[PDB]
Amino acid sequence: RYVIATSAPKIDVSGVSVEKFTKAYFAKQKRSGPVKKDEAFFAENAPKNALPAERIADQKAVDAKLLPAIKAIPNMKEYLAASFALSNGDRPHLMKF
Amino acid sequence: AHVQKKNPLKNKAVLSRLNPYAKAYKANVKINSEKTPKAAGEKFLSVLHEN
Amino acid sequence: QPAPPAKAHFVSTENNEPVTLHP
Amino acid sequence: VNIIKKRTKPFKRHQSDRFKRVGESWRKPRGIDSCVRRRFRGTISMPKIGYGNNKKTRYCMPNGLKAFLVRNVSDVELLLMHNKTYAAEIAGNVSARKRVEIVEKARALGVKVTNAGAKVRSQ
Amino acid sequence: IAKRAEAYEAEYRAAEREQIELARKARAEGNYFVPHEPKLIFVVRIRGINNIPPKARKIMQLLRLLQINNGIFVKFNKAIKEMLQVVEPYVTYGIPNHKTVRELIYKRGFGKVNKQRIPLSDNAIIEAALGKYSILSVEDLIHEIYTVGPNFKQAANFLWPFKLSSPLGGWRERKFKHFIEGGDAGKRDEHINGLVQKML
RNA sequence: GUACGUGAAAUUGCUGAAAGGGAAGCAUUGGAAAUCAGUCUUACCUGGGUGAGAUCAGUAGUCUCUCGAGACUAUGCACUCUAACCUGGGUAGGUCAGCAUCAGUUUUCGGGGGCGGAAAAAGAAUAAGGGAAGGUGGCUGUUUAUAGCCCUUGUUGUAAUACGUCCACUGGGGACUGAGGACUGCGGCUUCGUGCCAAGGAUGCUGACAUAAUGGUUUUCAAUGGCCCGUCUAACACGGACCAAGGAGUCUAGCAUCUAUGCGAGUGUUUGGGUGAUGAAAACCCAUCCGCGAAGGUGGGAACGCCCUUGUGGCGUGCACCAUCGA
RNA sequence: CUGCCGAAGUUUCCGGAUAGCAGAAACUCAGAUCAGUUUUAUGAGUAUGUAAAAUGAGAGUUUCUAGUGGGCCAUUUUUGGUAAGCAGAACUGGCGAUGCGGGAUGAACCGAACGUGAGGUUAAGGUGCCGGAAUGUACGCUC
RNA sequence: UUGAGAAGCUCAGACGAGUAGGCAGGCGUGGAGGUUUGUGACGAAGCCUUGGGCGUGAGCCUGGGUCGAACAGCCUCUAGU
């Protein structure tokens, strides 16, 4: 619902394996209360919740197998990097998406 | 029994509970074709277009 | 018991042609 | 069942805000000259049986447990089988010692004591 | 029940088919054709309970009318027609087609058992009260109601007065003058159809 | 601190915060400030190992009750059980946000097709005939020519659309509600064991939070409403400076109704007498008077038998009460 | 303090009555016992009353017991009336006991009769601003 | 399936102004008998409160401050309520 669909030209997603993602893929990392050895009241640490090596790896992977696809469509690499912002003088209902 | 008043026009399950005919209706039967004939008498059209 | 109202019937106009009036 | 109130502002006897002799507890007016009795619009409302609340979520605190005055240590014992529908409200004149022993036993029965903290400063 | 329904459903067409046929004959012949008259009428109240003459107050009691916007199914004859004219500025009647006689007993169909208002959401609700007159379901009840039969009095006393809402889209402009000068009161004939397709 | 137990209201002064453009007062919905509460503190639940023993002992004794049921004192802590510690795995209620498939009520866009009228009228295209003009080309006057128009019929027609309906035909969009609490039922799909289902009222998937998100309560602001109370008989008049405490259908006799209880052709001890060691004016017992009172048939009809037309109906006994003829 | 039922405000005789309206029990009948009602039939000089069809609805009997015989209007006949009002008799309703939307505020006007709320839809009346809703559509009027 | 305070429990419909009047259930105050193995100098009653809670309401329960000797709930009786 918080996505506005767009009739902008499409691409090929047959090369990317989206079935790797499931509803447990984006599940949060389970706070789980690992034993803190109650002295932890004093000493504090942090895992920096860093993105694991698996996430940064596939991010390079899935992008590498769609970047040439949007390179084929002109004005598409630079269509993505911009943002959307309606302006005074525009009215979303009558404009087409 | 009967906690809610279900509507047999807008619910398609209570309708079949009340009316065991919804499995054969065929509301729109093609009882005519291209060959429909005009049936308009001359003396009726004379009293029609009179005055 | 009540006297029932009137069902349908034809009425031929070969001897009685409908005349046109004006108010 | 979530508790609900049909009204939250209590009723307030007519012109009991102006005069200090007239108290705020409700008294139905008795004169047919009255604007209020004839129920003219704009005047204050009245207690009626319409504002009666749900017959199951009545007498319940906003949490859901009804109250119960426990005035000694064997009045909280009856609440052993009713710890999820009653809150052990301690009575007001109970001493600040007999109070600290109801709390230590109601806590074993899992009963919510609503005002266990009175006169009891903890260390 | 379906064996009764198949008989009824084909019969509604087979009487609607002939008035298609029996007018296609006369109009192509020069003959004229009065129709099978309305024998059912459907009366919907228009005015409240305030400032009603006592003569017209009794009559609307004798037509199960105790509230503004109540429809009832009543048998239409001479002694009904002269009774409606004396309550004419407080009611509104007209011919119901087969669709309103369906949508009023499927949506707002409430029976009368033990002087209680019990809905028509089960055939056993109808079989209990009207079993002894061979009425077995809503479809038997619709046939007996709309195609007037002998038990129509014994079936119109079953259904409650049809308590309807105010018509989506409103009434006309000024309500309590006779229908034939704008407004809506008295007979509406086929246009009581397009009034129930608003309240319902 | 003798202006002395507690020390309410009117009422007065100071301090703090507000508000106030020839009216405040209050009610409703909320903003701002202040402040308050909520269990959320933690708890829960699940294995192994280590130790402890008891309701355990292929165990010995005491007492109270009734063979064994509890309370015990030994001794072991094996077999069972629970349980402290160490070791590990999984796991709210509280509030507020979403989103999904639903149910109820409802509103607003459509999509498709039947069925009807002059089997809509038009119209288009195409053959006849007729007519003319607000007279075109041509020459003010004329009849399709170098524009065309109208009327009638044929034909494309076995026409479209519109209008009025109907679909137990279909795509969506928004809104409020979630009452009830094992299964009982009506149903539909099944897949032949079943089970499942939009089918007798909501469940599921997540996310924020306890130096907290919501929720209140006060002062005030905004919007909208709001003729001063009681007695009178539209306004009035009459009462009202305010606060506190007092203050008005009570007791008794008689009569009648209703209800309750005790006894019942009876009923009522208390004028008295007897008794009462523990308020002995109580309770309890009671003589002789006395007061009030003191079975006729015929029709229904409550109920109950026997029925056999299941019932219906028949058939018998018929209370109170009511008619009918007896006295 | 809350809840339930809830009138008359006119008689009929003689301040007392009876009836009525509201009530309590007992006891009747599930029937044609009824009905501020409409049909059809008989008559009667479109109206009049009488009886057995429609339509609805369960009806009935007494016993014992409170309040109540004020009026303000609106409705139509209406005779006496006239500069001009009007005066009076009868019928029907409201209000008295009734709040609510409009009618700018008003009891006699238009709608509507009320438990506590949410969501929808309307009546009356409205949609230029105050004021929630079309400076909408159509055709004719007016200086 | 336990929901037998049968004075309880449970299912379903309709209804909701109200004057004189009629009926019913409750709230509160002072004393009396019974009861709470009742509360109280670790603070009873009272009083005040920009605190919280319940009931439709009469009212009740409670936190904080003040204060200093008595007091309340339940079932009945009683009225100078």
Side-chain angles (χ1 to χ4, degrees), chain E residues 118-130:
Chain E
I118 299 305
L120 303 199
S121 83
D122 212 333
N123 300 315
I125 312 189
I126 296 171
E127 191 269 350
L130 308 186

Side-chain angles (χ1 to χ4, degrees), chain D:
Chain D
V1 195
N2 303 338
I3 321 294
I4 35 173
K5 299 297 140 70
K6 288 207 187 151
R7 202 176 156 83
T8 304
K9 308 298 304 167
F11 301 86
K12 182 182 145 297
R13 183 205 199 291
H14 182 40
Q15 283 314 120
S16 72
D17 56 320
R18 186 180 289 176
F19 301 105
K20 287 146 171 90
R21 48 174 180 274
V22 181
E24 276 132 29
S25 64
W26 171 251
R27 313 257 169 227
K28 174 207 186 285
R30 296 302 193 174
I32 64 163
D33 194 297
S34 170
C35 292
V36 192
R37 193 228 270 279
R38 299 229 206 158
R39 220 187 315 165
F40 284 140
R41 204 211 61 240
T43 64
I44 44 159
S45 47
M46 283 156 195
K48 292 195 287 293
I49 198 65
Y51 309 84
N53 292 274
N54 199 340
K55 196 195 276 283
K56 314 165 170 198
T57 76
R58 255 176 80 184
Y59 304 121
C60 289
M61 310 215 168
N63 47 47
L65 319 96
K66 303 177 181 180
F68 192 76
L69 272 75
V70 317
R71 31 188 90 84
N72 58 336
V73 200
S74 61
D75 276 1
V76 75
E77 172 46 3
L78 319 97
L79 260 56
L80 155 54
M81 290 257 290
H82 289 269
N83 60 344
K84 278 180 196 66
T85 181
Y86 268 106
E89 191 65 324
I90 309 192
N93 52 350
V94 182
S95 91
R97 174 251 301 270
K98 174 154 299 166
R99 180 172 308 254
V100 318
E101 316 197 48
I102 281 155
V103 186
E104 81 166 60
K105 190 223 201 206
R107 194 171 40 221
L109 317 170
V111 186
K112 303 309 173 191
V113 176
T114 325
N115 50 359
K119 319 176 171 188
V120 85
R121 59 180 289 270
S122 279
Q123 102 179 16

Side-chain angles (χ1 to χ4, degrees), chain B residues 8 12 21 25-26 33-34 36 38-39 44 46-47 50-51:
Chain B
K12 299 281 146 174
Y21 191 43
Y25 194 38
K26 284 332 310 173
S33 90
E34 184 70 26
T36 50
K38 216 95 175 160
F44 163 70
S46 179
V47 80
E50 188 265 349
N51 197 161

Side-chain angles (χ1 to χ4, degrees), chain A residues 8 26 51 61 73 77 85:
Chain A
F26 301 100
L51 295 51
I73 288 290
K77 161 76 188 64

Side-chain angles (χ1 to χ4, degrees), chain E residues 71-85:
Chain E
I72 68 156
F73 283 134
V74 86
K75 171 176 173 64
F76 177 82
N77 60 59
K78 61 224 163 49
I80 279 309
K81 175 188 167 194
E82 304 99 26
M83 180 170 32
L84 293 184
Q85 312 304 102

Side-chain angles (χ1 to χ4, degrees), chain A residues 23-40:
Chain A
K23 214 203 308 170
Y25 181 90
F26 301 100
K28 296 236 190 188
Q29 293 224 150
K30 202 187 176 186
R31 52 183 73 184
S32 58
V35 74
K36 324 272 201 73
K37 202 58 72 184
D38 60 346
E39 90 76 31

